[PDB]
Design a protein around this ligand. Structure first.
Ligand SMILES: NC(=O)c1ccc[n+]([C@@H]2O[C@H](COP(=O)([O-])OP(=O)(O)OC[C@H]3O[C@@H](n4cnc5c(N)ncnc54)[C@H](O)[C@@H]3O)[C@@H](O)[C@H]2O)c1
Ligand SMILES: NC(=O)c1ccc[n+]([C@@H]2O[C@H](COP(=O)([O-])OP(=O)(O)OC[C@H]3O[C@@H](n4cnc5c(N)ncnc54)[C@H](O)[C@@H]3O)[C@@H](O)[C@H]2O)c1
Ligand SMILES: [Cl-]
Ligand SMILES: [Cl-]
Ligand SMILES: [Cl-]
Ligand SMILES: [Cl-]
Lengths: 411, 411
């Protein structure tokens, strides 16, 4: 039977149980220190006695440098798995493999992904697995890791499973309130009149953001309703229009102090057709909306300073961009291009204090061939986007993370 | 209905039809020059008239630098798809995205993978798609690309579909005979008494190699039969033994002039068990054979000079190492570690003129959830390994290529 997944609501504790952090690397102790107040931390013990089920189990693998040392994964996890609660979170933290410092160490840190993806296919009742890599150059405090662990170790990550998160070397500052992490931020969401975009607006506003909801003229009525519901503003415009950057710039100058902290390139279309049967309009329309427009909005709003230091850009990719899909040579090209935008701009935007990442949804109820045996919800996608958008996620850039319940499909 | 795939046999032309090479980049013309004698090259024409079906179609995308330029994929391929023969080969050649020279160019070169993987899911009757990336620093002649194109553009690649090949900057020398590419090479194949290993030995010997077939004492009878059939030698040994490197070194010194040109780390075991139910022997045995032994044989034989300039190391990974598999936290860790060995040693071994790569088989008859709607054969795996082993594949290192018929499963 498919598990009814717990999802986030204000005031509900992050985990449905205790948090055990172990392993003998460089992140276990600073992570225990950082999470002790908001989580119910418990220590490991040889007797295998714990009053509560584990809501979260984190293994710090950053100290493993030899294949003989991989046995620590086995000895740590085997006594703990039967105490996992439904919808528990299992996380392994390693070192970015190319930075691990020796051939042997790079081999074992790379091997961790085989372990985590397999373990995810063994967990039951909605529990998920995650692999987080941390740069070898992060400071001892590992503050740049905190927003990633807090996203994973919460109900917000309910439909993210089997994924790899890649954290760089930079220190982070926490938001004033981890429960309102986007407080004071101005967020532009394209395609916000319906679907995933409308839910992104709601989750952003839940987290304290001021949302500029963008959609086409034909959706003006629904767009205003979304904007009013979230306490934000509605901007009707076609993202392919020549003056799109001008219009967004004028709008946030008029209403929101002249800046954009978060840009979500969510607007998109499909024109499905086998390539042998496709005409030019079906190709061109899809490239214009799904690839040219996100590139132009991102470069234009960074280029005129509207998005500045602390900025966050998130693009909507798709599993079709990663695995391909019959009838979608146009669409999948644009969604692989959205990954390309994150990967190509990440070093360029890092000089400006801006991150850029991509989310690749799988099956979103807008089904069963995944570890959670169910389809995702729009809120599950919006939560991953909000994680990237956090002011505390400054050390997370160039990532593509799938929100798919650990779907079988992929590359 | 599943297509009966054409596979390689000496004297059969490489393609089942003509070869059309197009696109306006830096590889179209030198590739036409290199392949003109052995292939039946035809030019594109606006009338759409060709006497024969296409056995191969190659599009050079290295000149595309702007998303508006991606339309060349559409205009080139749409008139050509209906003339593809059964088991045809479609290839797109691009530039390594991080080397493409501008943000816009990196975006479009990265986007090519969405296009190719989608097109593969539209081709019919056994035809396959491939994406090849070539370093921006390759010389105009693109000689380092030739062994990759010749593998793809042949029946040898029958079960390789949807994959990405990554070619570096180095020039290559062709073998004296592309139909006996391993002539004169000494190849060590572990686990060669049965299964995929026995077929690797046969394909290597077909291609002209002298094979050292390695397996355990209990398989001595079958091992000798394989060795005799391929004209090579049998070496009984357990690859986990302390003196394994010594014994291989002594064996090739006694019989094969003291050197190893090709090492295939194929021996492997499984001990499947849910991690919660697994004991220490099931973990340790799998790490010892599948990860520690390949690392030790590779580093030991490079370290004592038995594998030198021109050497080739190929490891057997697995789709389980990429996607994970229930009950295989031990096995999948080792198969992700085999990818880690290729990725970590590639820069170290490049200083010695040695490449190292990994092959990840999917479903090998030892089924239907792939683009070819059928399971692979051991020969299909062996052909991909022989491609890496070619003396002309010196510009191919650090690659992991799946042999899966474009399986739906993955990461
Ligand atoms: N299962 C899924 O729905 C799914 C899966 C993977 C990825 N995605 C991606 O997620 C995003 C949201 O998908 P969705 O299913 O909610 O889509 P949708 O079609 O329901 O909504 C997209 C919105 O974008 C708007 N839009 C389209 N073209 C526009 C333009 N030129 N200018 C401004 N607004 C424009 C539409 O009017 C619409 O309100 C898209 O980028 C889509 O490709 C969706
Ligand atoms: N479908 C598949 O068969 C499949 C799929 C993906 C990957 N692989 C990998 O491909 C390789 C070959 O698989 P296979 O199915 O042919 O396996 P197999 O079990 O049929 O044969 C492997 C051979 O290795 C030998 N071997 C095992 N331990 C050894 C040791 N310590 N020293 C020396 N020889 C040893 C065995 O005796 C056997 O002859 C393995 O690495 C396997 O993990 C196989
Ligand atoms: Cl450490
Ligand atoms: Cl169609
Ligand atoms: Cl060029
Ligand atoms: Cl079991």
């Amino acid at each position: 039977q498919p598990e009814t997944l717990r999802r986030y609501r204000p005031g509900d504790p992050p985990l449905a149980g205790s948090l055990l952090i172990g392993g003998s690397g460089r992140v276990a102790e600073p992570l225990r220190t950082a999470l002790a107040d908001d989580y119910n931390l418990v220590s490991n013990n040889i007797g295998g006695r714990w009053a509560d089920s584990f809501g979260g189990v984190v293994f710090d693998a950053t100290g493993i440098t030899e294949a003989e040392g991989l046995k620590e994964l086995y000895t740590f996890f085997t006594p703990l798995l039967r105490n996992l609660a439904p919808c528990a979170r299992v996380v392994v933290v390693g070192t970015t493999p190319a930075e691990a410092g020796s051939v042997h160490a790079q081999v074992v840190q790379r091997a961790l992904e085989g372990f985590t993806r397999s373990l995810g296919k063994e967990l039951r009742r909605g529990a998920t697995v995650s692999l987080v890599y941390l740069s070898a150059d992060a400071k001892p405090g590992a503050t740049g890791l905190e927003s990633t662990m807090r996203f994973i170790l919460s109900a917000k990550s309910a439909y993210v499973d089997g994924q790899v998160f890649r954290v760089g070397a930079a220190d982070s500052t926490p938001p004033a309130d981890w429960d309102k992490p986007l407080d004071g931020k101005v967020a532009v969401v394209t395609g916000a009149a319906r679907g995933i975009g409308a839910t992104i607006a709601e989750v952003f506003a839940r987290d304290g953001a001021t949302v500029v909801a963008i959609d086409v003229d034909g959706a003006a009525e629904d767009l205003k309703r979304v904007a009013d519901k979230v306490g934000g503003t509605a901007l009707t415009l076609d993202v392919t229009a020549d003056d799109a950057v001008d219009k967004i710039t004028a709008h946030v100058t008029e209403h929101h102090g002249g800046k954009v902290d978060i840009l979500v390139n969510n607007a998109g279309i499909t024109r499905d057709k086998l390539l042998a049967n496709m005409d030019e309009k079906r190709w061109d329309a899809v490239i214009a909306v799904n690839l040219l427009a996100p590139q132009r909005l991102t470069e234009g709003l960074v280029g005129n300073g509207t998005i500045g230091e602390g900025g966050r850009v998130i693009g909507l990719s798709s599993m079709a961009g990663i695995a391909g899909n019959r009838g979608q040579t146009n669409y999948a090209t644009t969604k692989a291009g959205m990954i390309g935008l994150a990967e190509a701009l990440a070093p360029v935007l890092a000089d400006k204090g801006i991150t850029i990442n991509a989310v690749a949804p799988g099956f979103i109820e807008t089904r069963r061939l995944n570890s959670l045996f169910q389809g995702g919800q729009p809120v599950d996608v919006a939560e991953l986007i909000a994680y990237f958008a956090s002011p505390a996620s400054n050390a997370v850039t160039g990532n593509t993370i799938r929100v798919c319940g650990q779907a079988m499909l992929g590359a």
